[PDB]
Design a protein around this ligand. Sequence first.
Ligand SMILES: *[C@@H]1O[C@H](CO)[C@@H](O)[C@H](O)[C@H]1NC(C)=O
Length: 337
Amino acid sequence: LTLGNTTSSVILTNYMDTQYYGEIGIGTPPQTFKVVFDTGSSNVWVPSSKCSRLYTACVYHKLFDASDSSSYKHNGTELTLRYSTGTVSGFLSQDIITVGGITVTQMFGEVTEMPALPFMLAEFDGVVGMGFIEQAIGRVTPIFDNIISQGVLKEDVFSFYYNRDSQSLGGQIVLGGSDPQHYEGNFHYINLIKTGVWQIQMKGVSVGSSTLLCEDGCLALVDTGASYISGSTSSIEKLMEALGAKKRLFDYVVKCNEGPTLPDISFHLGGKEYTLTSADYVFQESYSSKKLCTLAIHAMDIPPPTGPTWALGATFIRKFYTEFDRRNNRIGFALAR
Ligand SMILES: *[C@@H]1O[C@H](CO)[C@@H](O)[C@H](O)[C@H]1NC(C)=O
């Protein structure tokens, strides 16, 4: 590890409090893409010009064309990348990637198979995995490791601010630090269970008064690429019975008028209770007894070995500015502002 004196920031767009993405450039001259920065995965991919237009997702997204880039390096190894909400497939390529200040030579997936559900619902084009090399498909070096190798970042850390939803900043990633403008009070740290996954021990989940969930302890994936807080089908059907909420296809709803008096939900991480108020986890889009309001908490059964686990996504990170510390293998939380 070599440390320099560089901090680099990426500005994010917030779409409807569900999608947070920024821009990268790939190739010479730069081809620009909207990407989610996802601590829950370790690969880079964008849609490829070689994607058949029978994938409607490839008609509606920006496609990388290797034939327009003088800095492209062929590889051609096939790979498949499995996300919580769906799967993409394609092949490895190498090119120059620009993110914030920084230019890095990077191996990434050119995606040629991009299912319409869910990718026709994506405002973003692809993904930049901020996870560890241990979970990288094809054992490809992740972008942050490649950036650390350059020895220009002040610290072996990166940080996420996600805003609530023209003039407002949707969010901000800091590579090599934190922005004290977007948090207050002190960082509280939890150690990773292990290097290789941004996953920490959780000691309990309260609904108001009572620890009625994860009573014997459980896992929390701190997942910048997940919209919601997620638990297993079994944990969530309990949480949602206790909130008086009903299942739609994939999510849970409450009568809009009941939203504001739903109880506080607390997550016990390291020393502290991380408390969400109903305003933090209800899409309070109306106060009518005659409309339904979605909850920013749903069921996700993440397969072993990472899961079963909770995932703390944008619902959580909106309240708690999050620092991901590779040097000391830990996660810091502070109150966002
Ligand atoms: C693809 O990339 C990997 C990782 O560096 C390399 O070891 C492999 O030989 C490459 N294959 C081709 C065919 O260029």
